[PDB]
Amino acid sequence: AAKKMVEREEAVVWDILDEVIREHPVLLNRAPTLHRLGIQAFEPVLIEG
Amino acid sequence: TEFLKPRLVDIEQVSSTHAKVTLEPLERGFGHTLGNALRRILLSSMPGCAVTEVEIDGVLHEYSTKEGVQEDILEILLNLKGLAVRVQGKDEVILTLNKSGIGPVTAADITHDGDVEIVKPQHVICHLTDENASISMRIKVQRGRGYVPASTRIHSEEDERPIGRLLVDACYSPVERIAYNVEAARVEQRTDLDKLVIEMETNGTIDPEEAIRRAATILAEQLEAFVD
Amino acid sequence: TEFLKPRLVDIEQVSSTHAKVTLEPLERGFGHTLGNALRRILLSSMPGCAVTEVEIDGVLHEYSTKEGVQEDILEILLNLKGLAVRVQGKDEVILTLNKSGIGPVTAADITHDGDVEIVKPQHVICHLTDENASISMRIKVQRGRGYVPASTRIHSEEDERPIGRLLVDACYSPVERIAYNVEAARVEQRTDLDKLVIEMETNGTIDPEEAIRRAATILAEQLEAFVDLR
Amino acid sequence: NGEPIIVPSQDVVLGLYYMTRDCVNAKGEGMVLTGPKEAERLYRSGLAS
Amino acid sequence: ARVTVQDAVEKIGNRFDLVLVAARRARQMQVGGKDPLVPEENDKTTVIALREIEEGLINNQILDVRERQEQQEQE
């Protein structure tokens, strides 16, 4: 039921995602990660697109 | 064909002369419309009164110097321009201040009539070095709207004023700074909306929400003609 | 408070589409404020009718062809997306276009009802080449604002779709170009007043004084949130 | 090297250069202002460049 | 610490000990269900534990004597 509720993409799923994302960082790697600062962690904000 | 009305969600009152009207949500490309319209009205059209002309003894133009003071007459002109006065009944009041003795001269030292008052009495005017120094200035207060500076004031005037009269920029409108952003809010389906954040800092004589409401009703009464 | 109020004094029609309008008198400095605000509102938020669903007989998808015509079905859908309709009473109507014979298919060949007015009688759609060819499309004209595209309308449609209801994107806004000018007003006792010369360019379907009235009501009802509440 | 890596780059730099450079007699030179608040009020009103 | 944790760095002394003690506290909040002593303002456990250490209700030896105290009153 959780799998199909995500794969139906309900508004309760969008609200739950908006609560999960809140201050939980992600690492934006770029390769070729030459020097040390090629991995930085950001707190994501949601956009469409 | 129905439009989104907002709710005014926040007045974060930082100080008594500071506000931040967080405001959400508007249609896509309407935050800039409301913000720019209010900003131009609040800058160059909001009515109010301040000091325009001042006649001081001991000086003949804007680059002379009276004794007994640390600061010079450009500084007394600038600190005079910073003074925020409100006039209730009339619109052309002349005021006169006289100060002698060891100590600074503040805004509470002025002689006031029944119609005028000072919104910040501890706002400094000048300082006095000599106890024998007797400063005297004839402070005229007109009432206009917005901002008119002394440069185009002296370009626009033609009548020969008596020597000793000093021109100053007339900060008629009571706001000091308004600058907004437009952020992006979200109604549960459409993410394309936008949220207004209007910042405002004024002088005395008004409350920032009163200035915002005044500008809004100025524009509404301006557009009151051809509506349905 | 020594302010004034403006009125629409002279409304000249240069043509049926391109038409200027004055505003008089405006206060000092207000000209660019009202001009830019009316520009943003008059370009974003005007209601106009447009083509939404096209239903051709014997045509399944939009990437097919049909013998007898010259322009393909994507070309027909683009030339129908450019159409300019003015309805009066309803908010959703269905037109009909039926024509046979060799020659171009103008927009003036649509068998119109009473409350629909097609304001471009030289808008070409098809070029029928065979005399034994026919074309019978049934257009659907809604009414809205902004830009609502085919992807979002297929996502948001809760109903089913029979094969043949080809979905055309909706360009609802009938205003295409608008410029304002702040001249010097000719006031017999004042020199510090100005006029606003808004130069609209419409789709032919919207009446300019009605458009200006609606944009003014939109601006006033948006500012009522500032006026009433704080 | 102990020199920061969050440097503005080319567009912020063009904007800050265009802010902090000065002409000779542009518009309203030689005025006296209470501070940044009155100066930015002047610039957004357009009475001084 | 919701934008920069340098105040918590000055409170602890070292980034790795900061991560270790904040991980200890966040694990205690997610497993043990202990109450966060700073008001949470709808935040996650990691930023709550960093804000706890940043305020100064918890250090390493403070958490150590606290866990030892609940241990001895449990036994």
Swiss-Prot record, chain C:
Residues 157-160 are annotated as: Required for interaction with Crp at class II promoters. Keywords: Acetylation, ADP-ribosylation, DNA-directed RNA polymerase, Nucleotidyltransferase, Transcription, Transferase. It is an enzyme of class 2 (transferase). It catalyses: RNA(n) + a ribonucleoside 5'-triphosphate = RNA(n+1) + diphosphate. Changing R40C: In rpoA112; temperature-sensitive, blocks RNA polymerase assembly. Residues 1-230 are annotated as: Alpha N-terminal domain (alpha-NTD). The keyword Nucleotidyltransferase applies. DNA-dependent RNA polymerase (RNAP) catalyzes the transcription of DNA into RNA using the four ribonucleoside triphosphates as substrates. This subunit plays an important role in subunit assembly since its dimerization is the first step in the sequential assembly of subunits to form the holoenzyme. Part of the processive rRNA transcription and antitermination complex (rrnTAC). The complex forms an RNA-chaperone ring around the RNA exit tunnel of RNAP. It supports rapid transcription and antitermination of rRNA operons, cotranscriptional rRNA folding, and annealing of distal rRNA regions to allow correct ribosome biogenesis. Homodimer. The RNAP catalytic core consists of 2 alpha, 1 beta, 1 beta' and 1 omega subunit. When a sigma factor is associated with the core the holoenzyme is formed, which can initiate transcription. Both the N- and C-terminus interact with different regions of transcriptional regulator CRP. The rRNA transcription and antitermination complex (rrnTAC) consists of RNAP, NusA, NusB, NusE (rpsJ), NusG, SubB, ribosomal protein S4, DNA and precursor rRNA; S4 is more flexible than other subunits. This is DNA-directed RNA polymerase subunit alpha. It comes from Escherichia coli (strain K12). The lineage of its organism: Bacteria, Pseudomonadati, Pseudomonadota, Gammaproteobacteria, Enterobacterales. The chain holds residues 6 to 235 of 329 of the full protein.
Curated annotation (Swiss-Prot), chain D:
Co-administration of salinamide and rifampicin or salinamide and myxopyronin suppresses the emergence of resistance to both antibiotics. Coiled coil: none annotated. Transmembrane segments: none annotated. Acetylated on several lysine residues in the presence of glucose. Disulfide bonds: none annotated. DNA-dependent RNA polymerase (RNAP) catalyzes the transcription of DNA into RNA using the four ribonucleoside triphosphates as substrates. Resistance to the antibiotics salinamide A, salinamide B, rifampicin, streptolydigin, CBR703, myxopyronin, and lipiarmycin can result from mutations in this protein. The RNAP catalytic core consists of 2 alpha, 1 beta, 1 beta' and 1 omega subunit. When a sigma factor is associated with the core the holoenzyme is formed, which can initiate transcription. The rRNA transcription and antitermination complex (rrnTAC) consists of RNAP, NusA, NusB, NusE (rpsJ), NusG, SubB, ribosomal protein S4, DNA and precursor rRNA; S4 is more flexible than other subunits. Belongs to the RNA polymerase beta' chain family. This is DNA-directed RNA polymerase subunit beta'. It comes from Escherichia coli (strain K12). The gene is rpoC. The chain holds residues 495 to 543 of 1407 of the full protein.
Swiss-Prot record, chain E:
Keywords: DNA-directed RNA polymerase, Nucleotidyltransferase, Transcription, Transferase. It catalyses: RNA(n) + a ribonucleoside 5'-triphosphate = RNA(n+1) + diphosphate. The RNAP catalytic core consists of 2 alpha, 1 beta, 1 beta' and 1 omega subunit. When a sigma factor is associated with the core the holoenzyme is formed, which can initiate transcription. The rRNA transcription and antitermination complex (rrnTAC) consists of RNAP, NusA, NusB, NusE (rpsJ), NusG, SubB, ribosomal protein S4, DNA and precursor rRNA; S4 is more flexible than other subunits. One of its GO terms (molecular function) is bacterial-type RNA polymerase core enzyme binding. It comes from the Bacteria. Belongs to the RNA polymerase subunit omega family. Promotes RNA polymerase (RNAP) assembly. Latches the N- and C-terminal regions of the beta' subunit thereby facilitating its interaction with the beta and alpha subunits. Part of the processive rRNA transcription and antitermination complex (rrnTAC). The complex forms an RNA-chaperone ring around the RNA exit tunnel of RNAP. It supports rapid transcription and antitermination of rRNA operons, cotranscriptional rRNA folding, and annealing of distal rRNA regions to allow correct ribosome biogenesis. One of its GO terms (cellular component) is RNA polymerase complex. Signal peptide: none annotated. It comes from Escherichia coli (strain K12). Its EC number is 2.7.7.6. This is DNA-directed RNA polymerase subunit omega. GO terms for biological process: bacterial-type flagellum assembly; bacterial-type flagellum-dependent cell motility; cell motility; cellular response to cell envelope stress; DNA-templated transcription initiation; intracellular iron ion homeostasis; nitrate assimilation; protein-containing complex assembly.
